[model samples]
Target: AECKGFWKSCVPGKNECCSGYACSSRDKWCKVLL
Candidate 1:
């Protein structure tokens, strides 16, 4: 899992999110949809 810039690499089943990002079950990092 290669992440670029503010993007972060995450492992499946791990609920870890970046400082201002969120982790979804789809195994990816995303910004606050708001």
Candidate 2:
């Protein structure tokens, strides 16, 4: 699946973010994984 870059808006549990990152449920944006 195509992933979104950091800071990009993403749908939680629906959209896949870029490597080492995930979609944020709070704001629906791609966030860096800790």
Candidate 3:
């Protein structure tokens, strides 16, 4: 599975944004939805 949100774990080739959060392509991590 891909990373859901910030501090969340994710697998390779998978990506997704979690509720109230956004995805970061640079860091490959989710941050507070802005």
Candidate 4:
């Protein structure tokens, strides 16, 4: 997986967000390696 930016603006119960190349779910730490 590649490094990415931070999703500090992420909120709970929202759609999936990405930090550059990384993939995150909601506002949790469940990061999906890209």
lDDT (C-alpha) at residue 4 in model 3: 71
What is the C-alpha lDDT profile of model 2 across 1-34, one tens digit per residue? 5668888888977757766786778988888866
The per-model lDDT (C-alpha) reads 0.50, 0.78, 0.59, 0.42
Worst 10 residues of 2 by lDDT: 14-23
lDDT (10s digit) by residue, model 1, range 1-34: 5332235655545545544555665646444535
Candidate 3: the clashing residue pairs are none
The most accurate candidate by lDDT is 2
Candidate 4 Cα outliers beyond 4 Å, as residue runs: 1-5, 19-34
Write candidate 3's Cα lDDT for 1-34 as tens digits: 6447676654444546555665556666656844
Please give, for residues 1-34, the per-residue lDDT of candidate 4 as tens digits: 5433454344345424454333345445334444
- Name every residue pair that clashes in candidate 2: none
Model 1's TM-score against the true structure: 0.30
Ranking by TM-score: 2, 3, 1, 4
Off by over 4 Å in 3: 1-3, 9-15
Error of 3 at 19 (Å): 1.4
Rate residue 33 of model 2 by lDDT: 65
